[PDB]
Amino acid sequence: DIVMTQSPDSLAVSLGERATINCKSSRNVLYSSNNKNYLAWYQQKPGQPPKLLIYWASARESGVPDRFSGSGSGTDFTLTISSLQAEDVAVYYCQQYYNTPYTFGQGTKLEIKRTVAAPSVFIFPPSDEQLKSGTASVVCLLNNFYPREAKVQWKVDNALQSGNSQESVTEQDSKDSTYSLSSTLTLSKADYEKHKVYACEVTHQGLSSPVTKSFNRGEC
Amino acid sequence: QVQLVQSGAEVKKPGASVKVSCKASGYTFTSFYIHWVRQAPGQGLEWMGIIDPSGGSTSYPQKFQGRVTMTRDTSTSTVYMDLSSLRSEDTAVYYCTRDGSAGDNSWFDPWGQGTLVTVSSASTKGPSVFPLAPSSKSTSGGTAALGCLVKDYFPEPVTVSWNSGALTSGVHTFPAVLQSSGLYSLSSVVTVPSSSLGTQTYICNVNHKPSNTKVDKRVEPKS
């Protein structure tokens, strides 16, 4: 089979700038007697089947605007999007059709560049009704930050915890191009009564110091 | 015209079989090939077979040689993807595509809608909804946040809304996550002005169609 490697894995581009994604191969995929490469560039949005975007590596189907191009020969190829708008955020794949493997690519997500912003942190003590179920969940939420990279560290009685927390991240918003993050910590009723203080710590580029939203049982 | 449509989603225990139909319409059914591809959740695309009408091969890669069986039908113009010996790593979405323009060509132009297949040992049950009490001393500015949390549901079509569509601005619903017991959890939050904390009512409602369960609850300030 042919192993197709596509780089860079992810990129962020502002509005109205260039953007290039490169898709390499493992064996020379041209063909004498015809001189025709053998490649295809696709595009997938969430909750949508991939739709063909470029074929023959130098032609486009009907309906695709002129902002999308395609050039290259031999082993390495390129896309070179011309102008970036708000509706061009998707995942791109490259596929070859000269061998039985039908190998594709890896996927290169696109984002929109913007100025750095600071997050907002909010903690939620567990509800009284939840105590009857024997499970305690604590959630501290991060809102309206950029970039995605943010470090969340849970502390109970000034002790580090691991292996009992889950994280979830929302898709980039279409209004202000920002994110929200959720960090849920779960534990049993048995170990709730022998601890005193719980908190979560946030590390981010836009914050000079880790913001401490301390919480203690009994609202003391 | 020139379109393919498939069946609905399926959830089954390991060891069972799966049948998927790809009904075609618009073109001459016996002049083009047809391939099947699959997509794991969060991974890249794959390739798992090929078949042509008017009789022909059903070729597979090495890892799908003795497992998948791809039949053919005429008049009704349907294809099948009998799959056997399910495992836990098969939960995916399946697409059926055709070749187009003959020759040696792929051009997977008219993809189908794809069907979702889940393989698990859990059992269907209804979700549980709880509120998240705010902080009465949190006055960072003119805005605060509330939320309601859903727990222990399977399978995972779940629609959550706030105040029966009254509240739309400032809502956030996060994707579901997997637990150790094979049951999903999810949470929803809403940011509202803090000055009107004790003015209007707030209710979050959840619908789960598999279990045909509708649950309304109302998050309210704490003491």
Next chain:
Amino acid sequence: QPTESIVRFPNITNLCPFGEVFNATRFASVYAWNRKRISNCVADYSVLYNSASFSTFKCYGVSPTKLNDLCFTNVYADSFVIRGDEVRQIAPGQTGKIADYNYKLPDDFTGCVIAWNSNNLDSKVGGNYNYLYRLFRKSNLKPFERDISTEIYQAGSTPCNGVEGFNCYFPLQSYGFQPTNGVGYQPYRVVVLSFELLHAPATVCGPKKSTNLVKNKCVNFNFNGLTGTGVLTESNKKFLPFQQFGRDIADTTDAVRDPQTLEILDITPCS
């Protein structure tokens, strides 16, 4: 000089149900002969050839032995009752009452014909009329057609309007089985196996397994019934998804597609 030998056959271990067509009970008549299609299986013809209960086992295109070294795309099986004196009639290039009128074997039929006596199982006292043969037909039959229509005949210029009588006879009549007659009138079971080969992946093959493949050596190879000697190396050429083997000019096999992997290998004559 070659050093080793390599063979490669598909990853399949499903025994072919050859007993269903042979060991069943209710078999159709001659002019309504049944047809069964066989594919995607492995079969052993040695036990079929060595049966010792086979009155006539005659066949063409392949030798009775060595048949476990060939692969085909499809198999077709037919079965019918034929009276004892007319077993010879099921053969290429024969003119007769039943072959020309009910079922004619094509001249280029590359396959096998089996016939054996079953008088102890189908002969009935007083007359077995269950099995019937078409006696009266208007036109000759091209190879491999089935006629079911039983419309009345008009053998003269005066139409009978569907009433039997003068110049109008029923094409269908009973055999009249009786175990008290001679050898010639006795019945015989007849089964025809047909074979075909096209440019498509093989489905039904013979016994014996495969071995690991080697490269960069002069080796004797057998891929799906294709034998050769040479050096196997890696090449690059366009191969359509279904085409199996490609050849260079002057009818020399240059590249072969390896089963179980869909890899493409190049053959170079070792010198």
